[PDB]
Amino acid sequence: MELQPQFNEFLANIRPTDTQKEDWKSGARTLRERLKNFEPLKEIVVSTFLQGSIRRSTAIRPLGDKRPDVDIVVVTNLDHTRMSPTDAMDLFIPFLEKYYPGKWETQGRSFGITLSYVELDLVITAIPESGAEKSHLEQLYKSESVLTVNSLEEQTDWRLNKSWTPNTGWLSESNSAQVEDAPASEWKAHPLVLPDREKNEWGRTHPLAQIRWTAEKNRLCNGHYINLVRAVKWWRQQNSEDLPKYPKGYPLEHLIGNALDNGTTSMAQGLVQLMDTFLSRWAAIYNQKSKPWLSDHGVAEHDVMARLTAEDFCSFYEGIASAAEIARNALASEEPQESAQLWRQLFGSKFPLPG
């Protein structure tokens, strides 16, 4: 059976709690506000925005001593062609030393700030364009759709468009018309550049395209996509000893989004469909003992699975193959208790029994 109320309760159980949601909101709010008002950086800092699984509403509740994490991307106007990545990153060391002494560390492509209630990542980026194209891109990056403080789940009406404005419950004759994503010719081939200290160069990154694709795929799947990502992450967590360390995080989310068809009608149907499609689509790659290439949504030349090994991918494929038999039999069951017991064999005790 589909057991839609049971899946709703399960999802409520595996989402980040209200306390954790407020914690990441508070942390990001404070960090961005202190960045905004820091005089030594007001010339280079164009804007800031949120990225990460919590921003995309594809994150599950942290377990035990782990804390929620969000990334604050800092869009600057630095010239990446005339400044080394390390210099651009070190421009932000006085800020961290003033506001987060003893709690920040330098990482490969960002800074990591560790608070007791949240973990923050400060991502310094630059705009490669110049002139009118840079002006239009800055118009986009200063819009309310980019600056938003709400997660994807909290704003169904969100689009990647500089004309989009948030809605607080009610609005009528003013503007009840839904805007759409800006045409791809305005952003798709315009990624930001990001310092890489271990490679010592500026690489391309396009978080806005990733967020936009996530939101559109959730709309095309009637809001089931982010919840399916969460459910699969929870399944992986409950069976971590039987699964390889990777894929996890965004590569796992990307695999899920690739496997899932549009038009999903329920969580159970979506799970079975995405698992069957994953198994048939990558059966040849798996038999080759290889791994698939899957391009990043914003940088087509980047492979999301670049760091995944073929061995880990094939181990994960076998894990999905074992989970898919349980999922198919759970969906096919016509008894509520049997169906819920199979769903619980997949997901654990956070999935409830009807009675």
Q: Is 157 a catalytic residue?
A: no
* Among 23, 71, 296, 312, the one annotated catalytic: 71
* Among 121, 261, 276, 312, the one annotated catalytic: 121
Local structure of 333: helix, strand or coil: coil
Would the annotation count 29 as a binding residue?
no
Would the annotation count 208 as a binding residue?
no
Would the annotation count 260 as a binding residue?
yes
Would the annotation count 269 as a binding residue?
no
CA–centroid distance for 180 within its chain? 21
Would the annotation count 261 as a binding residue?
no
Closest CA to 57 of 266, 267, 228: 228
Would the annotation count 287 as a binding residue?
no
Quote the crossing angle between the two packed helices 267-281 and 310-332, to the nearest 10°: 140
Residue type present at position 96? L
Q: Is 303 a catalytic residue?
A: no
Would the annotation count 304 as a binding residue?
yes
User: 323 Cβ partners below 8 Å, 6+ apart?
Assistant: 235, 239, 275, 346
Residue type present at position 303? D
Would the annotation count 146 as a binding residue?
no
Q: What is the DSSP letter of 353?
A: P
Would the annotation count 210 as a binding residue?
yes
* Among 69, 79, 276, 303, the one annotated catalytic: 69
CA 99 – CA 104 distance, rounded (Å): 10
Would the annotation count 55 as a binding residue?
no
Q: How do beta strands 201-205 and 192-196 pair?
A: antiparallel
CA–centroid distance for 113 within its chain? 19
Q: What is the DSSP string of 264-309?
A: ---HHHHHHHHHHHHHHHTHHHHHTT-----B-SS-TTSBTTTT--
Would the annotation count 290 as a binding residue?
no
Would the annotation count 13 as a binding residue?
no
Is the bond preceding 247 in cis, omega lying within 30 degrees of 0? Answer: yes
Would the annotation count 250 as a binding residue?
yes
Binding residues for ATP, as ranges, are: 51, 53, 56, 69, 71, 109, 196-197, 204-205, 210, 233, 250, 304, 307
Binding residues, as ranges, are: 51, 53, 56, 69, 71, 109, 121, 196-197, 204-205, 210, 233, 250, 258, 260, 304, 307
Binding residues for Mg(2+), as ranges, are: 69, 71, 121, 196, 258, 260
Catalytic sites, residue numbers:
69, 71, 121
